[PDB]
Amino acid sequence: ERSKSLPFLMKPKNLDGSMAGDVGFDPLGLSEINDVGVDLYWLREAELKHCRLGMMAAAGILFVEILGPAPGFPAGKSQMDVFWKVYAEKPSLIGASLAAIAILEVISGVATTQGRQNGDRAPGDYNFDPLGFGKDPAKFKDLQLKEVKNGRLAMIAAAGMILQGVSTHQGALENLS
Amino acid sequence: EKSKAVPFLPRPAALDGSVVGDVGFDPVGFTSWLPLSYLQEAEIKHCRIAMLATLGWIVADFVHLPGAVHEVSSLAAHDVAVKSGALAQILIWTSIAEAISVIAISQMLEGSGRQPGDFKFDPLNFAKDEKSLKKMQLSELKNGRLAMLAFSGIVTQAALTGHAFPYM
Ligand code: CLA
Ligand SMILES: C/C(C=C=C1C(C)(C)C[C@H](O)C[C@@]1(C)O)=C/C=C/C(C)=C/C=C/C=C(C)/C=C/C=C(/C=C/[C@@]12O[C@]1(C)C[C@@H](O)CC2(C)C)CO
Ligand SMILES: CC(/C=C/C=C(C)/C=C/[C@@]12O[C@]1(C)C[C@@H](O)CC2(C)C)=C\C=C\C=C(C)\C=C\C=C(C)\C=C\[C@@]12O[C@]1(C)C[C@@H](O)CC2(C)C
Known part of the structure; x- marks a missing residue:
């Protein structure tokens, strides 16, 4: 009856055990929202998209700062400020990436709403397993848990890197030391 | 269900199999409110x-x-x-x-x-x-789609950079 994460709180009604990373940590009861097209399905899809985006962004920042930029690309070690140097010399790359992300996000929203309507697609599912790393069950749950935990950690990390780069105008590991 | 092109999207419900070049690609559902023959002709x-x-x-x-x-x-x-x-x-x-x-x-x-x-x-x-x-x-449909995208790229690159046939 009590949430596993917060023993002083009752179990959130909509979070039983199903989703990976579920420990009952919903103090504000946001999982019970059923308005403005927002429900547990939409919240989970947003969480998974945030997890994946944060993982990609943190990996990119760390890669560029440690191993350096790719040939022909600007340096500076400040990832929040090197973006304007890339846009100053290769605006077409940024524009094409933005257009591609826009199209993919329109497709993602359509897929989310459709899967919410005629329930056949789990939240965050895009059938993207080209290498077959999660075919069999009893490993899919473990992979989902790993992805969720890594994505939450990378969300926090990427938000921290964004704020550090905006404020200190220095590199992430530069702030570290 | 589960259109061929986008495997996580439902079938567009107007493109079952009986059209040439029909991989079930209509995420925004243009075929749901327009005639299929009209769109094919266009x-x-x-x-x-x-x-x-x-x-x-x-x-x-x-x-x-x-x-x-x-x-x-x-x-x-x-x-x-x-x-x-x-x-x-x-x-x-x-x-x-x-x-x-x-x-x-x-x-x-x-x-x-x-x-x-x-x-x-x-x-x-x-x-x-x-x-x-x-x-x-x-073959005509695939070549035509490729040529539409190719002309788009050619015009955009030529307008961006006034170069000759290599529009890089
Ligand atoms: C979308 C079709 C299209 C359009 C709008 C144009 C437009 C133009 N072309 Mg052009 N061209 C085309 C296709 C087209 N071309 C094709 C397919 C070829 C390869 C043979 C050429 C080869 C070509 C050359 C070599 C030259 C032009 C030139 C020009 C410019 C002035 C003279 C002229 O009209 O061309 C005259 C066109 C020709 C001599 C060849 C046209 C052959 C046609 C397109 C193929 C048969 C299709 C058939 C007749 C369709 C019937 C239509 C139906 C309604 C009855 C003008 C901007 C001239 C210019 O100023 O260059 C900058 C020039 O020197 N074009
Ligand atoms: C209606 C809609 C879409 C939809 C739909 C459909 C289509 C109807 C389908 C469904 O049926 C429903 C629904 C709702 O899904 C809404 C669209 C979404 C919006 C409104 C898009 C918002 C995106 C904004 C982002 C993601 C911007 C991020 C900015 C960054 C800045 C980066 C910086 O580097 C910059 C530039 C300068 C640097 O110095 C430092 C920083 C600041 C870090 C980080 O990235
Ligand atoms: C949109 C795009 C790029 C957009 C870039 C933009 C907007 C950037 C604009 C800017 O930089 C400028 C210009 C100047 C700056 O001052 C301002 C900004 C704004 C910064 C590229 C698309 C590029 C699109 C491309 C490359 C498409 C390739 C398509 C292929 C290969 C299709 C193959 C098929 O069609 C066949 C052949 C058969 C079919 O049946 C099957 C398939 C497979 C679908």
Whole structure:
């Protein structure tokens, strides 16, 4: 009856055990929202998209700062400020990436709403397993848990890197030391 | 359910299997409120127009017709051809063809039996049975889509950088 994460709180009604990373940590009861097209399905899809985006962004920042930029690309070690140097010399790359992300996000929203309507697609599912790393069950749950935990950690990390780069105008590991 | 192209999206519910080049790609559901034959005709018309346009752009940046008016790049050829009246002739004959097309598409939508884009233009055969016709329709659709995207890229690159045939 009590949430596993917060023993002083009752179990959130909509979070039983199903989703990976579920420990009952919903103090504000946001999982019970059923308005403005927002429900547990939409919240989970947003969480998974945030997890994946944060993982990609943190990996990119760390890669560029440690191993350096790719040939022909600007340096500076400040990832929040090197973006304007890339846009100053290769605006077409940024524009094409933005257009591609826009199209993919329109497709993602359509897929989310459709899967919410005629329930056949789990939240965050895009059938993207080209290498077959999660075919069999009893490993899919473990992979989902790993992805969720890594994505939450990378969300926090990427938000921290964004704020550090905006404020200190220095590199992430530069702030570290 | 679970359209072939986008495996996580539902089938567009208007494209089951009985159209050439039908991989179930309609995420925004254009076929849900527009006739399928109308959209097919529009797509095939775009394919043919853009194939001709890509070939003409690339060729005219290499070979020029005799005369001083034909000595401009394809990027600047529009303002020269419109002034000389060269594009007026193309406009006149294209308008005639498009009025006949108005009649044809109206008849196709109101029964008839004319397949979308089927003008029966076939001096040579190149398509003897149903299988050959289907294969060549798929080839035409794929080549037309590729040429539409290719002309888009060619024009955008040439406008961005006023370069010759290599528009990099
Ligand atoms: C979308 C189709 C299209 C359009 C609008 C244009 C437009 C133009 N072309 Mg052009 N061209 C095209 C296709 C096209 N071309 C193709 C496919 C080729 C390859 C043979 C060429 C080869 C070409 C050359 C070599 C030159 C031009 C030039 C020009 C410019 C002025 C003279 C002229 O009209 O061309 C004259 C066109 C030709 C001599 C060949 C056209 C052959 C046609 C397109 C193929 C048969 C299709 C058939 C007749 C369709 C019937 C239509 C129906 C309604 C009845 C003008 C901007 C001239 C210029 O100023 O260059 C900058 C020039 O020197 N074009
Ligand atoms: C209606 C809609 C879409 C939809 C739909 C459909 C289509 C109807 C389908 C469904 O049926 C429903 C629904 C709702 O899904 C809404 C669209 C979404 C919006 C409104 C898009 C918002 C995106 C904004 C982002 C993601 C911007 C991020 C900015 C960053 C800046 C980066 C910086 O580097 C910059 C530039 C400068 C640097 O110095 C430092 C920083 C600041 C870090 C980080 O990235
Ligand atoms: C949109 C795009 C790029 C957009 C870039 C933009 C907006 C950037 C704009 C800017 O930089 C400028 C210009 C100047 C700056 O000052 C301002 C900004 C704004 C910064 C590229 C698309 C590029 C699109 C591309 C490359 C498409 C390739 C498509 C292929 C290969 C298709 C293949 C098929 O069609 C066939 C062949 C057969 C079919 O049946 C099957 C498939 C597979 C679908």
